[PDB]
């Protein structure tokens, strides 16, 4: 395309802009889509979100959830899942190898966890802080191995 | 970018003014009254097209009715005879015949009068 003839893909650039003040021929004149003389037709707006006209809102009607660990943050974990790790190409899965594969950031010290049930064909040698009993069963059903770092 | 209105309002206003040419005083001078008169005149024109279609039929019926009463026949029976004889002619052309061609109009009335239906 030249600079004197440049075109967008159809139905990508231009869409029908709803002009609210330019005449009745567009169907959006005078009132401009607000309705007629009520609260929603003034400049203020649409009240508050969640309001119910004075009736107790839904959130104010329902009991509050409880936070057992008040003031704490859940310990984040980096999880290696067995259904997808097969797609990744590597053997002897340790922290350093994941760093080279850039699954984990080198500036992170989160403990590695092993999760999954899906059967894997080739054997892998994991170095994981935590592993499920049946995930370990699947891994050791093949000729792989898992060592639990402490 | 301050777009300024000029030649846009005046052109569309002068169109309405041009349409309302020949009106009484301010009805052709001021744009507002001119616009109202054109809309009202358009409504009148629309309604009178329909009313013209009906009024000219009535006038043809009246002329045809008169042309028949001079010969002793009535409109109500003339059309019935026309239908039974299968003759299909507008009252417009029939009235035009009775005003322009008295002899041939009299020929049509003579055939519808007595000749065997079909």
């Amino acid at each position: 395309m030249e600079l004197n003839q440049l075109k967008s893909v159809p139905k990508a650039r231009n869409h029908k802009t709803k002009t609210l003040g330019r005449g009745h021929g567009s169907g959006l004149g005078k009132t401009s889509g607000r309705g007629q003389k009520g609260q929603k037709a003034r400049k203020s707006g649409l009240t508050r979100p969640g309001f119910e006209g004075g009736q107790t809102p839904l959130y104010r009607r329902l009991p509050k959830f409880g936070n057992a660990r008040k003031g704490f943050l859940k310990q984040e974990w980096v999880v290696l899942n067995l259904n997808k790790i097969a797609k990744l190409k590597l053997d002897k899965i340790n922290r350093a190898s994941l760093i080279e594969k850039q699954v984990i950031s080198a500036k992170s010290q989160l403990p590695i966890k092993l999760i999954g049930h899906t059967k894997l064909e080739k054997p892998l040698h994991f170095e994981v802080h935590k592993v499920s009993k049946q995930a370990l069963k699947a891994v050791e059903n093949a000729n792989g191995s898992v060592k639990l770092l402490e | 970018m301050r777009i300024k209105g000029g030649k846009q309002t005046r052109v569309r206003r002068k169109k309405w003014l041009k349409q309302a040419s020949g009106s009484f005083g301010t009805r052709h001078a001021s744009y507002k009254v001119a616009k109202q008169t054109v809309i009202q005149a358009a409504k009148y024109a629309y309604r009178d097209r329909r009313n013209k279609k009906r009024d000219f039929r009535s006038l043809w019926i009246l002329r045809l009715n008169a042309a028949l009463r001079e010969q002793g026949m009535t409109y109500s029976v003339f059309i019935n005879l026309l239908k039974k004889h299968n003759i299909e002619i507008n009252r417009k052309v029939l009235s035009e015949l009775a005003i322009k061609e008295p002899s041939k109009f009299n020929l049509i009335v003579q055939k519808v009068k007595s000749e065997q239906p079909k």
Binding site: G50, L58, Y59 | -
Partner: protein, 59 residues
Amino acid sequence: MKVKSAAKKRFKLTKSGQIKRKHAYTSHLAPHKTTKQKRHLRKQGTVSASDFKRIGNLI
């Protein structure tokens, strides 16, 4: 936009976007309800479709 502090602490989300909630009438006046009513109100629920739209933009 700020998430409403009352919308949270009362509405937890799920995998498919459903908004979990707790049943009301479970704070006091226990003898005025039957054990069937109490054990049915103990379980949690989800907001109805009439409120799903209003809670989605609230969270």
